[model samples]
Target: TFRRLWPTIAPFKAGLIVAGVALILNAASDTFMLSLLKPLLDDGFGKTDRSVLVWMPLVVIGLMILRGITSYVSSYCISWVSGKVVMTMRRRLFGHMMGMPVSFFDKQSTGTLLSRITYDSEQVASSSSGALITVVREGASIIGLFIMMFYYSWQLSIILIVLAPIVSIAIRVVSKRFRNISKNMQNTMGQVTTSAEQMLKGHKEVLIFGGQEVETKRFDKVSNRMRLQGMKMVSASSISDPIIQLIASLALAFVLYAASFPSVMDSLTAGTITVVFSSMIALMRPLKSLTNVNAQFQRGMAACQTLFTILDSEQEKDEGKRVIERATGDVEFRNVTFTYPGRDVPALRNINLKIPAGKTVALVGRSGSGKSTIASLITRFYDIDEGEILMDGHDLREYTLASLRNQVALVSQNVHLFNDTVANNIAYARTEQYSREQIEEAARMAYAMDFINKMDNGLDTVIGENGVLLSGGQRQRIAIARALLRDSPILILDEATSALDTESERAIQAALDELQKNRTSLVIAHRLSTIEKADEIVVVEDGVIVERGTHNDLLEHRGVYAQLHKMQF
Candidate 1:
């Protein structure tokens, strides 16, 4: 896990080194001040020397100023480096995840991915930063304090050293419990996030079915489980604190009692005793921080495990290597067979078909007849398991995937529009680089300008999420406008007008007819009337082409295509 994360900080090695040096300087200054306490108390105060006391305050104040400056620089530099490291990691992780195969997304929940990116990434950042700071700052401080303790009186130092084992044993026992509880807490957080996401995504269905009470009960159950686990963690941490404090107190008592003995008193001055006491207090802070590091380490480890799981995902193969500026739009599928991941039945099997350029072809079938699957394969959304696909006499793998997609514009039944202006949604095909005139032209071509101009904001009106605020037909028109803006040579209409009423469908169909002229178009329609004029209609049943011909030829044969036409009409 550390190996995976190391690359994030590879570019900032110099900044980390500088911060480390500053941290060591700060720790040294702190130790010097703590060690000076003994001499001041014994030589300055015990002898009642006013001259010695005069410069003492000045020296201590100067040391504090030095410590503060070093501390600030160390913390600022380290924090800057850590922030940059995490940002780089987030960008890489998000890009890699987006490039994964569609099957990866099919099996995972959006909420879980969201939690990994948001919550899990935060945990890694916090834990790693805390661990680094504690090791560089507190670790050095502890070492410096221990050296001062030995300098004051070796005998007393040895006694305190003996108590160290007791503290270690106690911490080990407590940390084991903390590690277990911390792991459980993180898992519980993922569940809570998942439930909340489900509620938000399915709010419409939940409201219509009056499932508010049932959802509330479900949420309560998960929330309660989270609460119980959180309380358990709190209870464990609470108990550990007092146990640590008790060990420190007992060690302190032993040192003070031994200091009072005649042999010890003869060797240790009052000032020396004061310095040892000051060093002990200084040591307490770092010791406490180190103890808490155990919990942070555990949390970080769990988060790393989750992050690496995503990084390890299998990515889709790169089939296309070269760019295809303008494809001939001749797609061929030969003996193709495919099954979705984790499913036993094949979606398409032993299918062979050829579509020529500059002609309209339609696939007619009932639901589950593998029409959409063929469309997806043409778009290279999924690869055929047993056969090959070709475009313009070149294997589909020969052209770049992006270049291939650029030549094909798809308008599906479920149109997704971003929360942006009408002009912006249409221009999304080309982005801001395209002039406003081009966007307006695309809108006019799709018959979207008629409705868009009537809105208060004209083309600048912002659509709601998923175009929820617009009527079904308006949304479909906007989607078509987006496709028109691309100006591709080929178009794929997959039930694009299935949800519209007869009047709206007729209007959109007229607009589509104008767009489809002189272009290679593949139409997959559930309504028979929409594709009756198709140049060639192919009837697919159970992944095989049972009939293929023009509308008149197929009707004369009275085959599967004729039967489907009769049923829909």
Candidate 2:
């Protein structure tokens, strides 16, 4: 785990080195202060050495000042490094997520990814900073204390060495326990987020179906699992500290007993015995600190394991070297077949289709007949398993994904609008690229200007989350406005008009027709009336294109398209 994390931490090497020096000084100052106990007890206690008194107070003050300065530097520098690490990791994780294949999303829930970025990253940071500080600072102090005791009387120091393995054994057991508990806790926390997100997104359905009790019960179960896991961690952590402290106390008691023997008492001075006994007691504090941080360090390692899984996973392949200025919008699929990840049946089968540079094709089918799949393939969201997809006479995979996607504009039924100004939503990320007049013109073309102009802020108004404040038709028009602004050569309308009512559909139909003009467009819709004027209508059933023709020609053929037209009409 440290090997994996070293590269990220390596950039702040100078800061970490300074922090290391500060920690060493901090530990040394503490041990030097303890050593002062010898002179104070031996010289100043009984013998009236006013010299020892005068120098003792001055030395103690200087040592404490050094300790304070070193502690602050170490604390600040370590925190600074850890904060940078967290941000860098988060940025890398988020960037990777954006480029991941659609199938990766299908296999992992949004809530789990959210937990990894937000919560798991935080745990790893804590491990890096807090756990690191404790280990380095306390380990240094322990070593210094041991040196002080051994310097005075190596005989008594042997007791501590004998008991060291016992404390370590206890900590090792507790560390494993904490790691397992943390893993479970992280997973449960993801469920906790997913439960709330799902509930909130479907709040209206929950209320209408009277599912309050069931949802609450389900949430209670997830929350209870989290609570149980947290309690187990706490129990293990609590047990670990006392076990370590008990071992240290036993060593301290043994040192005192050995010091009381007449033979040893005769040989060592009062000051020498005092220093060894004091160092043994002081050793317990740093030892306990090290054991306490073991939980955090172990939890951090477990979190790292979770985070690395996503980071190490293969990103979407965009190996195409071919870059295009603008595609002529000719697309063809030859013998294309694909199956979604983790599914036994193929979604598309030996499909052959083509759209010329400036023609619109409509795909009509039952709900699961793979109409939308054909539209998605044009964007290369999932690579076809066994066929060639050509755009502008070249294989689709030959062109860079970004350049290829730039040529196609998509407007789907489930329009996602950000909580931002109307103008910004219309322009999206290209807010600076398009002028206000262009934005207004795009909105005008989509017929969204009427509702937008009625608002108080108009183009500058902040739409609520996902356009919750707007009507369904209003949101749909805004989406259409965005696609219009893109002005791409190819358009894909996936049931884009299915959500709007008749009046709204008729209004947007004008916008849609204008949007598709002089462009190669693919229209996937259940509403036959919308596609009656399509240049070619392909009737699909069970991943196969059963029939294809113009509307009037298909109606006269009395095939599957005729049957579908009959049902719709």
Candidate 3:
């Protein structure tokens, strides 16, 4: 951990060196006052001159002034360095998380992972700084006090040294508990964040379903364990202090008794005894402070281990060298098979299909019948377990991810909008390419501008989180407008119109048909009737293509398409 801390402070090594010097000088101040009291108290100052009144007070004030300056320097330097360390860590953590695979996100909770970046990083930064300050500043004070004790009497210094192992045993016991609890605390904090956030997001569900007691029981169950661990931590820290003080007291008692020996009395003056006795008191004060901070040091170490794990994690694979300047959008699936990471069943199996450069293919199926899986596979969200997906006769993997994505626009089943103006949502990534006039045009094409224009500020009105200010249909409109604006050559709409009103879908279908003429599009549909005009329709059943034909041909054939079409009506 000490070497691990070096790089964060390396840029500010000059500040650290200056702080170190200040701390040492600050520590020397502890010994200085004791040195002055030694002869003044023991030798009797009754016969002192007027100079004693002026010079002694001035010396005490001068040393205090030096101490104050050093204290200020040490605190400011350490704080500056710790703040930078946290910023560096957070930036790297967020950058790494964003680069991870979609599959990785499925296995991790958004709230818990967020806690690691926010709360966990904070713990490490705070603990490491506190531990460093304690070790450097108080550590120097102890060292300085010990030197004065040794000067007064080496025999008494041995008593101070011998008490180490006994107090250290208490610190060790308490420290182990702190380390174990801290590991659990990070995860505990994650659960608290995840559970609370999810519950808050679902507050409407809870209210309508009358789930207050249901959520409370869960909240208590999850949060109570965290509180108990906290109590145990407090208990361990509380118990350690008195035990440490007791052992230190025993050492103090031994020193007092040892000083009464005839051999000790013959050599000792009041001055030397007072110096040794007082220095030991000053030394023990800092030693006890170190013991008190042992729990924080251990907690920080545990946090350090957790934070580095994410920082060092592997990123999503993107090994291609080819860059798609602008894909002509002829895509093919050849003997493709895919299965999710933790699932036993394959999501898609032995699939083969093709879409020409400028045509539309509709994929219709029952829920969970591999319709959405094919949509994701086209974008290479997860690598296939077998075979290949090709664009322009080259495997999709051969194209650089950014270039392939640049040529594609996906309207996923799940639509999201940021908390921003209607104009910003439509212009999202291409604000540079799109003007307010163009954004408004795209919104009307998607039938979104009908409601958007009704809002108080029209195009400039701010939407709440996830566009909570709009209806489900309105949010979907914003998503459609986004893709409409992108105008990418290859468009994949996975149940894109699922949220729209029937009349809106009917009118927008005309606009969408015109828009699809010059591009390649894969449309995944829920209502089989909605895709009747698709240039060609493919019916998927049980992860495999079951039927393929124009809408009327498939209906006349009376197979899976007829069955689904019959069910929808």
Candidate 4:
């Protein structure tokens, strides 16, 4: 675990070293203060040496000042390092997600990812910092106190050593229990988060359907499991302190009984006996801390394992060496086949097609007949299982992922917009500052400026999450504006107008016609009216293209396309 955490911590080595030194001095000063008790008892109490009296008070106050300074330094350094580690880990995780293949995200839930970043990462950091300080600072003090006990009298120290194995076994059992409970708790935490998020996102649906009782029962089941695990953890760790303290008290009792013997009494002075008793009592606190830290340390190790597994997973395969400027907008799929991960049936099969430069092709099919898969393939969201997808006569895989994606613009049925100004959403693809003129032009091209002008802030108005504040048609127009701003040579509209009414669709269709000019466009839709003007139309069924022709020609052929058009008309 230390080996895995080394790189993240290596940059803060100076802070760690300073904390280490302060911890050691803090422990040493504690022992030094204990050592003064012997002198204060032997010289000042009976002999009336005013010298010892005057200096002992001054020296004790100095030790208090030293401890205060050392404790602050160690605490500040650990907190600084822990906070940085959490920030760095979160940044790396988010950046890594951006580079991961879309299939990776398909297998993970939003809540699981959220829990790992927001909760699990915090556990790893806090455990490392808090457990580390306890082990170093308290462990050192425990050892120093033990040395003081042996210095005063070896016989009593030997009695305490005999009980060490008993204390060790108790902690070992408790530590194992804590680790098991912690793992289950963390996993259940993900379920809890997922449940809450689902209910919150679908609160309106639940209310309309009268599913309040069902959702409440479901959430209660998950939260109950969490409560059970939490109780198990508390029970295990809470018993550990009293068990260890009882054993230490047994050793102290034996030491006191032995001190009653004449031979032992003859060997010890009042000052020495007083110091031994104080040191034995002091050992209990650090020993209890050391044992408790075991639970924390084990929990941290489990969290580290979970986090490291993701950081080590393979990223998206981008092996292409060629980089291209703007493409000429010719796209072809030569016998391409693809199956989504963890599925038996193929999503697309033997899909041979071509879209020449400055032309449009339309793909129409039933809901699951693979119309949308065509758009996903063009974006390389998932690599094909067979054959090739080419852009401008070169294999799509030959070009770098970034440059290849840069050549295409997509507006799907689901229009996702971030919580930002209208102008920012329009110019979302640009890294540098975007021109106000260009943003307005793109919005005007998509006919979104009508709504923008009515809004209080115009282009600067902040949209709610996923544009929840906007109607479906308005949101679709914003998405269209974003795609227009990209100015890619290849345009794909996959059910883009499905959300709009007939009048809204007619208005956006005019803007889309202008956007598709001089670009190779692929139109995937259920409505025949939108694709009637395409240069070629392909009808697909069960992952295979069944017919291809112009709209009028397909109608004359009286095949699948004609049947679909007849039903819609």
lDDT value, candidate 1, whole model = 0.76
* Candidate lDDT (C-alpha), each: 0.76, 0.78, 0.74, 0.78
Looking at model 2, residue 232 earns an lDDT score of 66
lDDT of 3 at 196: 67
Residue 175 in candidate 1, Cα distance off native in Å: 13
Per-model TM against the reference:
0.72, 0.72, 0.72, 0.74
RMSD of each: 11.0, 11.7, 11.7, 11.3
Give the best candidate by lDDT. Answer: 2
Angstrom error at residue 395, model 3: 2.1
Residue 448 error, candidate 2, Å: 0.7
Give the clashing residue pairs of candidate 1, or none.
38-271, 42-271
Per-residue lDDT tens digits for candidate 3, residues 1-569, read 43265676578677667767777788888678878777666443555543244556778899889889888988888777777788888888889877777776775567887788778888787887788778787888787777776766667666556766666676677567666766666666666667767867987888998649978888787678657756765665566567667766776686577667666443644557767667766676688778877887888878887777777788778897798788885888898888877889777778788787788888876445546767778677777789988888798988888888678887654567777887887787677877888887787777666788788888888875754467665565677678788888888876654655757676556656656767898888665555766778887775777888688888889878888787767
Q: What's the lDDT of the predicted structure labeled candidate 4?
A: 0.78
lDDT over C-alpha atoms for residue 317 of model 3: 83
Q: Per-residue lDDT for 143 in model 2?
A: 86
Per-residue lDDT tens digits of candidate 1, residues 100-134?
77776665677787787778777787787788778
Candidate 3 accuracy as TM-score? 0.72
Stretches of candidate 1 off by over 4 Å are 1-7, 18-76, 94-99, 107-109, 166-254, 260-266, 269-285, 288-315, 369-371, 418-424, 429-435, 451-475, 501-506, 550-569
**Order of quality (lDDT):** 2, 4, 1, 3
Superposition-based RMSD of candidate 4 using all C-alpha atoms, in angstroms: 11.3
What residue pairs are clashing in model 4?
A: none
